[PDB]
């Protein structure tokens, strides 16, 4: 037997991130995993800005960037007959279009990058152990029982052979899409797990720089199942094909014998659309693929899983230290379960964007080499019928971009509503523009803190860099110095750290560009209370005494006290 | 990329009043810039520009004579 604060079952990106963050806040975690190592298989690889921000908070951003492929190599999505064959056309994927890129730059100090979960996982697992988590692989969760004071789980050790018990105050179910932890907690799911009659993933190696370096992209999709994908793992060199020496399916996809090819492992994917309606069940919290299982369309899986962990850790830390009532843990479900449903529905809906491509070419699904060849030559036709076909195809191709980088709103427009956000008595604004395609910065409580550039010592710093570090932060201008004193009083009163930044001309942080003035929807003396997880929980118009009194209440409320 | 930060200050070594994003350095201005043309802003003193073009003109076939004054026609 053994005792610890949190038991994390699973060392995929959510469990690992959980361990790191809890270890960074002084909380004892034991993280476990049935397998001998981190995921070898072909899995996620698009890392969006929200996940990069979180690494930037933890100080792992420069490491990930070192191993990741940059945005600049991800831009050209090509649709073709084969890699060596003729292109139907290209879309500007992963915000490579100048305007998409501007909306990207403004939204965050971080950027897209491609980094196979294969590297991401061990990076984070090793940091978690370095920061203080205990990490044990080849250990299987067999089950647990709860009571009023905590939980007791039974583990099976695949090295020693022994079974032992672990006592803990909480359990995080971050096993994968077949989570046994979710099964025991009794969580309800909506949706199915194999939708129709899936995909085969052939990993392989081959120098394709002559076919790719003049048109750098993350993926190359072939219409030939109707569709097959060719995704880059390491620039122009290591690869998967998606669809034993029958894997010269590959040669068909590249479209040539000439390039030598070493075949790696092959595996299978199915089509899922299933999420948990509720992610918590007294003392058990479930996290990544365990509560949202979905197709790969849009990069959303890994990124959502890391953000699930970022939302929970700080709350668990506060509760375990008696700085907050257990009530605070309910906001995990309130804030996070919607995002799970959203992600699953979005990924599945992104598969509808493909059939219309075949409709534009007048093709049945799963067409035959002749029919395909007819469609290609119609496309080249110097008639008005051929012009219509061309345009139809363009309209069809463009629409696929939602699954391939265009869904910036889905990525960033979280709006929490829970006990952990204190409403300011502003009317809800909606979105001016489409909320799936476009991010809208908001400073209203429940929104994520916008990014703008300030300066510290004439050097650019992000507004977000004032704000993480496992602590609440309060932001203001010079007219708002009163918040400094009011904040101290509240930290003294309730037992919590509360950094205060007074932004302006004299100060440490100044807004040399006026972006802070412009972006906040609030006068200089107003203030934003930012959570550890970077979400605004409280906003005040000004520093009047009515505004100042509220702070102490907002805080006691947020923490359940 | 070296043209972006226009700073207003008391002196170079003194305190800044603030900065504006000059020469389309603001992300949105830069986007409108990229879409407009395949070319980009750059700083190149007329001091270098002139002789570059005078020499090309002569290379391509123009006759070029300095220290010669137009008096009238």
């Amino acid at each position: 037997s053994a005792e610890t604060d949190v038991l994390i079952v699973g060392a995929g990106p959510a469990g690992a991130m959980s361990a790191t963050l809890l270890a960074s806040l002084g909380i004892r975690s034991l993280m476990i995993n049935r397998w001998r190592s981190t995921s070898p298989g072909p899995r996620s690889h698009i890392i969006n800005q929200r996940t990069m921000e979180i690494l930037r908070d933890i100080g792992l951003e420069e490491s990930a960037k070192s191993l990741a492929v940059p945005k600049e190599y991800m831009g050209e999505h090509v649709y073709a007959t084969s890699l060596a064959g003729e292109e139907f056309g290209r879309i500007p994927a992963w915000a490579s279009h100048p305007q998409a890129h501007a909306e990207h730059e403004l939204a965050s100090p971080s950027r897209y990058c491609d980094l196979p979960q294969l590297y991401f996982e061990p990076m984070v697992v090793s940091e978690a152990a370095l920061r203080g988590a205990d990490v044990r692989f080849l250990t299987e969760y067999l089950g647990h029982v709860e009571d009023q004071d905590g939980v007791t789980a039974r583990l099976l050790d695949h090295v020693s052979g022994a079974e032992y018990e672990v006592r803990a105050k909480y359990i995080i179910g971050a096993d994968g899409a077949h989570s046994l932890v979710a099964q025991n907690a009794g969580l309800p799911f909506e949706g199915q797990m194999g939708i129709g009659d899936g995909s085969i993933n052939i990993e392989f190696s081959a120098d394709l720089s002559s076919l790719c370096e003049h048109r750098k992209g993350d993926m190359y999709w072939m219409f030939r199942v109707g569709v097959a994908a060719l995704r880059m793992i390491r620039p122009w060199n290591k690869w998967i094909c998606v669809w034993e020496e029958a894997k010269k399916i590959i040669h068909e996809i590249i479209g040539t014998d000439e390039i030598p090819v070493e075949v790696g492992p092959i595996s299978t994917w199915t089509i899922n659309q299933q999420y948990a309606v509720r992610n918590t069940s007294g003392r058990v919290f479930c996290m990544g693929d365990a509560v949202h299982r979905h197709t790969p369309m849009g990069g959303l899986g890994l990124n959502t899983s890391v953000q699930d962990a970022y939302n929970l850790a700080w709350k668990l830390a506060l509760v375990l230290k008696g700085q907050a009532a257990p009530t605070l843990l309910d906001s995990y479900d309130a804030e996070r379960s919607p995002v799970a449903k959203q992600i699953v529905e979005r990924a599945f809906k992104s598969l509808s964007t493909f059939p219309p491509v075949f409709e534009a070419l007048s093709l049945p699904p799963a067409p035959t080499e002749s029919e395909m060849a007819e469609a290609l030559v119609r496309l080249k036709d110097a008639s008005e019928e051929g012009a219509k076909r061309r345009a139809a195809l363009r309209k069809a191709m463009d629409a696929t971009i939602i699954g391939l980088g265009g869904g910036h709103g889905v990525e960033l427009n979280q709006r929490y509503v829970s006990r952990a956000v204190f409403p300011d008595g502003t009317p809800d604004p909606g979105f001016v523009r489409d909320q799936e395609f476009f991010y809208q910065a908001s400073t209203r409580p429940g929104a994520h803190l916008p990014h703008v550039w300030l300066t510290e010592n004439q050097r650019r710093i992000s507004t977000l860099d004032l704000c993480g570090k496992g602590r609440f932060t309060l932001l203001t201008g010079l007219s708002g110095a009163a918040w400094k004193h009011e904040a101290e009083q509240v930290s003294q009163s309730l037992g919590i750290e509360l950094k205060v930044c007074v932004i302006g001309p004299g100060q440490e942080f100044v807004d040399t560009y006026g972006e802070y003035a412009k972006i906040s929807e609030i006068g200089e003396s107003g203030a934003l209370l930012v959570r550890p997880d970077m979400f605004i929980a409280f906003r005040a118009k000004d520093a009047s005494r009515e505004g100042l009194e509220q702070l102490n209440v907002a805080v006691k409320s947020i923490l359940g006290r």
Side-chain angles (χ1 to χ4, degrees), chain A residues 182-189 191 193-196 198-199 201-202 204-212 214-223 226-237 239-243 246 250-251 253-255 257 259-261 263-268 270-272 274-288 290-358 360-368 370-373 375-379 381-383 386-388 390-397:
Chain A
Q183 229 184 241
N184 295 6
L187 304 177
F189 288 80
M193 273 286 261
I195 305 323
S199 71
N201 310 317
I202 302 171
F204 75 92
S205 214
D207 185 17
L208 309 172
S209 57
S210 47
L211 304 161
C212 309
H214 66 281
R215 44 168 192 180
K216 305 182 168 73
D218 187 55
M219 268 171 295
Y220 296 87
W221 290 45
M222 316 308 171
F223 295 109
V227 192
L230 174 54
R231 172 189 132 191
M232 173 279 293
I233 296 199
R234 242 49 226 151
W236 327 143
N237 186 43
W239 297 93
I240 42 158
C241 187
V242 180
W243 213 70
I250 298 180
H251 274 138
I253 310 274
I254 299 167
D257 292 312
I259 309 300
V261 166
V263 172
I266 107 163
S267 34
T268 329
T270 69
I271 295 166
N272 324 123
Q274 186 178 44
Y275 60 89
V277 182
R278 169 176 134 251
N279 63 16
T280 309
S281 179
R283 270 184 197 285
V284 176
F285 297 83
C286 289
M287 210 159 262
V291 304
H292 43 71
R293 21 258 208 177
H294 57 102
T295 85
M297 285 301 105
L300 269 31
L302 179 141
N303 296 285
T304 303
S305 301
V306 168
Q307 297 164 50
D308 285 341
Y310 203 47
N311 186 274
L312 182 52
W314 69 268
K315 300 179 175 172
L316 236 56
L318 261 55
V319 154
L320 289 163
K321 294 168 171 187
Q323 289 160 283
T327 320
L328 179 59
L329 304 176
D330 295 342
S331 55
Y332 175 63
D333 179 83
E335 295 176 340
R336 238 64 237 324
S337 289
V339 176
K341 179 189 169 160
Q342 167 199 25
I343 247 55
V344 165
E345 290 171 336
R346 196 73 215 59
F348 178 86
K349 179 170 195 199
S350 275
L351 296 175
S352 310
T353 58
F354 297 94
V357 177
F358 287 156
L361 297 169
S362 276
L363 289 183
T368 184
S370 188
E371 286 167 326
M372 186 64 58
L376 245 167
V377 316
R378 283 123 97 184
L379 226 49
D381 189 293
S383 60
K388 283 172 211 157
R390 282 173 222 117
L393 181 60
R394 200 68 246 179
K395 210 185 76 162
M397 285 183 302

